[PDB]
From a paper:
5 of THF and activates it for attack of the incoming Cbl‐bound CH3 group. These first mechanistic insights were confirmed by replacing Asp102 with alanine. In the MtgA D102A mutant, methyl transfer from Cbl‐CH3 to THF is abolished as compared to the wild‐type (WT) enzyme. X‐ray structure analysis of mutant MtgA in complex with THF‐CH3 gave further insights into the reaction trajectory. Therefore, both mutants mimic product formation at a late reaction state.
Residue numbers in the entry:
A (entry chain B), B (entry chain A): 3 to 306
The structure:
């Protein structure tokens, strides 16, 4: 059990946060990522709408089967593409989604094209407020009226968990990412300490623990990149890559994390089955921790 | 982490116990279990020597690849069969092994045949001293001169983790399982709190924590019990069964367990890969906690 009173956010019906076993893990699948084969032009945002709709329908089905809620990670490499990707997600699912790009200019341009829309404000989560934030970026977020953002504490100047906490809460003459988010009008903070590599997923998890111990913000991480760069294990193929993947993705959940960005949506079939199993074992512990489940839509009540 | 100084046993080279991150997880694979297709006659102990050698060679290879040591779980349905099984294991591997059977009189009968052989004393671990131990069982163990035993610290009267203090130490007019084991000349106790089903693996792990926190005995369990009877998952095939299995088998390691009985040895290829991943992430946490690895033969230094 975590020391601080946990913030539980209601993201247009998706509950995220709380004490371990209170709410199922929220699973965040990536679509239109670099090299996604359903995209034929990543600059114009031209993609197979049937194949994309099939992924969204599969996520709904897996979600209904396990009780794990989903938020879609929507990636783009251009303003034009990311704008079209967001319009498509708005119309073809009811789920919340992350507005994501490596390029902050792409994120901000796309956000500008969406204007002030009550549906966007309810469903769109900014991915992310990170070390390179600008006043322009914070202004674009405020003008869009967004209320939830991923706070990403990934930084090669902040390897140790406590240095990632310094990046979040601020230190000396740096306000920190939480303060920057608040100045943008963000009231709800999904804290992602970053995953440098597989082995340091324990440090990511230690940083999630400190966040939930002291602040009570929902904590999660995105270990898909580190897993896919693990040449030695990937070389082995199926099912060796998936079980190792499952070990990495479940580990933060075993230490009380609230959400996982699991990588490409095509991996949802095995990710949902691994994560739902962990959630069901943790919830069964609820009597010993003195926690009450916040919902009957829970893997413990569904997967057996 | 644990307050108690942890007992670390050396079982013919296999180190079992310690603080989390100090030693790799010991992996215990089952052979000659009920339904094992390499057995044609479970009463006479007629089995495929080439297929048994191949499993033991595959355990040695995976062990050398990850740094996870192994103990063999040797199951028999008759005295004649279990005797032959143990003679084969003695000759075809160097690993310690569990002498195991659903039928206590099969364990007792087999022990009589194997005699007070100094190799039996060094490599044979009694599986197990249970709630309903008999004087004839304790006499057989003493006469064989065994030094290590699994203490199955399980009872439907002691479902709560804290009740395992009662089972181990005794209570009221009941001799504890530790006192019983010592009367049989046992000096080294591998504590298994028992696993009823998948979900209750969280209660098993809380019991392991209590045992290590207060007594320092190595703690492990057999999640295999629940997983292969989980038809919903098994019938889905690869990789759904493997990732679900990986979630269950890794969970106790993430809470500080020292050994896992992972079921049939045919599953070693994906069990080693999942468990090595968890061990590597836990040991990486040593860099923050100051906990020193007790061996360079560790997944953290091998799998990347
Ligand atoms: C019950 N159990 C156990 C335990 O709980 N605690 C200790 N110390 N030792 C043991 N030893 C035996 C057992 C762990 N080993 C196992 C557990 C389960 C299986 C198993 O599920 N076999 C399958 C058939 C094999 C298959 O097709 O999977 C079955 O349905 O019976 C095979 C071996």
């Amino acid at each position: 059990k975590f020391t601080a009173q946990q913030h539980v956010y209601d993201i247009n019906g998706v509950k995220v946060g709380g004490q371990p076993g209170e709410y199922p893990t929220v699973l965040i699948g990536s679509i239109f990522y670099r090299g996604h084969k359903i995209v034929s032009d990543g600059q114009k945002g031209i993609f197979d709408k049937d194949a994309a709709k099939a992924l969204l329908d599969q996520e709904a089905e897996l979600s209904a089967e396990t009780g794990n809620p989903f938020i879609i990670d929507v990636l783009g490499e251009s303003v034009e593409a990311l704008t079209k990707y967001v319009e498509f997600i708005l119309e073809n699912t009811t789920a919340p989604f992350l507005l994501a790009s490596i390029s902050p200019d792409v994120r901000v341009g796309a956000l500008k094209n969406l204007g002030k829309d009550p549906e966007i404000q309810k469903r769109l989560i900014y991915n992310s407020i990170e070390e390179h934030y600008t006043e322009e970026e914070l202004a674009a977020i405020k003008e869009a009226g967004l209320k939830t953002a991923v706070i990403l504490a990934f930084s090669k100047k902040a390897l140790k968990p406590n240095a990632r906490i310094d990046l979040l809460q601020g230190k000396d003459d740096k306000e920190g990412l939480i303060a920057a988010a608040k100045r943008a009008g963000i009231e709800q903070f999904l804290v992602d300490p970053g995953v440098l590599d597989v082995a340091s997923n324990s440090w990511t998890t230690e940083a999630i623990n400190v966040v939930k111990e002291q602040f009570g913000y929902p904590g999660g991480c995105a270990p898909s990149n580190a897993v896919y760069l693990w040449k030695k294990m990937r070389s082995k193929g199926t099912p060796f890559f998936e079980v190792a993947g499952a070990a990495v993705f479940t580990y933060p959940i075993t230490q009380g994390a609230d959400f996982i960005l699991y990588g490409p949506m095509m991996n949802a079939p095995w990710v949902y089955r691994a994560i739902a199993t962990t959630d069901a074992m943790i919830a069964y512990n609820n009597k010993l921790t003195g926690v009450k489940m916040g919902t009957t839509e829970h893997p413990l009540l569904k997967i057996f």
